């Protein structure tokens, strides 16, 4: 099948360049036209550029004409889109696409490249149990969680028992804390029988700090009961 | 320039209930001596990619489910989802390709209305682990509900708190049609350590009044 294959998420600094990358394969890479998007956080579509990889005919938005280079490598079926000098105005998330002509739909999409530039430093994030309550429940449903807090830039991935466990797990957007850190919470609910014979674990990554953590969530035994 | 612009902004339709989204171009798409209306409609869940639902103005794309349709001519633009599903939560965006640069709409956002559900609510005191670090996280958890309006109100020795919480809200569930909702709040170590019980009050239509879950500090 088609697929277009983007690179992982950019972290940087005002003034750095930056080439992100899209593999295109299962179709002729040189007869279709791949193109750029960029959506900014919270916002919309914008078309950015198109390549034909045929010969390097290449067609810039007026909006970003000047301010991006697009550009081509056929013997990797590999289409690319740099800046010389990142502005903290490019963060975004950025799509590659295939294109049915100029005057075309974008009909497949790649999964999207997060770039963000900030000046800011990069942090890891410290990671707390949210054990699950002692008091007994209503419908033998007890809720449990990780908070995880303080780091920058996004995105904290968060998985249970290393994927085991999906059913019930709501991992919450992040929120920008006024330290100009984000913080999040991912819980789950689970039957309360299973607290004291199933061990539940929150695995945290943050990519940009390399930082991984696997944090156990255990009841609190208070009571002889 | 090519201006595109959908109508409503938002709709909230029932599971298996028709949902009609509007797009309008500035000018005409119809290239008459072809007879192609140049248009184009895509879905993008949260967290993905769009994908191409429509081109050709009522042409579907391959792998596309019956129930998703196209139609309109020159300026006026229609994309139906005849039987809403749970799954088909998203935004949707129409886009012009009748001349460059290629313009895309700013996005229909379609929600599943479904019968009321009262939150679940769960409160969390801050771990032993983070009280050592010097901070306590107080975490106010309502699971699972609908409508998403809601208010949480925190109290600390039953005095209403404000401007040291935040909150944050799932997506619509894809299956259950539901929200999540978490509201923190912050406060140090020594503020933390200053008050005895601490209260998360819940109000949400589902609820006949608001629910209050509360614990004393140190209690396990």
């Known amino acids: 099948e088609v697929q277009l294959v983007q690179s992982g998420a950019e972290v940087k600094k005002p003034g750095e360049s930056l080439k992100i990358s899209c593999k295109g394969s299962?179709?002729?890479?040189?007869?279709?036209?791949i193109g750029w998007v960029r959506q900014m956080p919270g916002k919309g579509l914008e078309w950015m550029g198109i390549i034909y990889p045929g010969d390097s005919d290449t067609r810039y938005s007026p909006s970003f004409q000047g301010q991006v280079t697009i550009s081509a490598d056929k013997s990797i079926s590999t289409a690319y889109l740099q800046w010389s000098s990142l502005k903290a105005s490019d963060t975004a998330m950025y799509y590659c696409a295939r294109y049915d002509g100029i005057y075309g739909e974008l009909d497949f999409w790649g999964q999207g490249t997060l770039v963000t530039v900030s000046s800011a430093s990069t942090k890891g994030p410290s990671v707390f149990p949210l054990a699950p309550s002692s008091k007994s429940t209503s419908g033998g449903t007890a809720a449990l969680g990780c908070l995880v807090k303080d780091y920058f830039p996004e995105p904290v991935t968060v998985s249970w028992n290393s994927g085991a466990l999906t059913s019930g797990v709501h991992t919450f957007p992040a929120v920008l804390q006024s330290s100009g850190l984000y913080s999040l919470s991912s819980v789950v609910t689970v039957p309360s029988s299973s607290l004291g014979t199933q061990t539940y674990i929150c695995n945290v990554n943050h990519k940009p700090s390399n930082t991984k953590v696997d944090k156990k969530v255990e009841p609190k035994s208070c009571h002889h009961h | 320039d090519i201006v595109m612009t959908q109508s409503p902004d938002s709709l909230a339709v029932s599971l298996g209930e028709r949902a009609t989204i509007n797009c309008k171009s500035s000018?005409?798409?119809?290239?008459?001596?072809?007879?192609?209306?140049?248009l184009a409609w895509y879905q993008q869940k949260p967290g993905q990619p769009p994908k191409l639902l429509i081109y050709?103005?009522?042409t579907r794309e391959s792998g596309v489910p019956d129930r998703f349709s196209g139609s309109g001519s020159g300026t006026d633009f229609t994309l139906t989802i005849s039987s809403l599903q749970a799954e088909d939560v998203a935004v949707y965006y129409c886009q012009q390709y009748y001349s460059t640069p290629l313009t895309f709409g700013q996005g229909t956002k379609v929600e599943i209305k479904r019968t009321v559900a009262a939150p679940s609510v769960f409160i969390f005191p801050p771990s032993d682990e983070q009280l050592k670090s010097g901070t306590a996280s107080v975490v106010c958890l309502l699971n699972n509900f609908y409508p998403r309006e809601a208010k949480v109100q925190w109290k600390v020795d039953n005095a209403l708190q404000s401007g040291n919480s935040q909150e944050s809200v799932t997506e619509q569930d894809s299956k259950d049609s539901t929200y999540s909702l978490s509201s923190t709040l912050t406060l140090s170590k020594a503020d933390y350590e200053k008050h005895k019980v601490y209260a998360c009050e819940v109000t949400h239509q589902g609820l006949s009044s608001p629910v209050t879950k509360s614990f004393n500090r140190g209690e396990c």
């Open positions: 299962g179709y002729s890479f040189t007869s279709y036209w």
């Open positions: 000018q005409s798409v119809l290239y008459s001596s072809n007879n192609k209306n140049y």
């Open positions: 050709w103005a009522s």
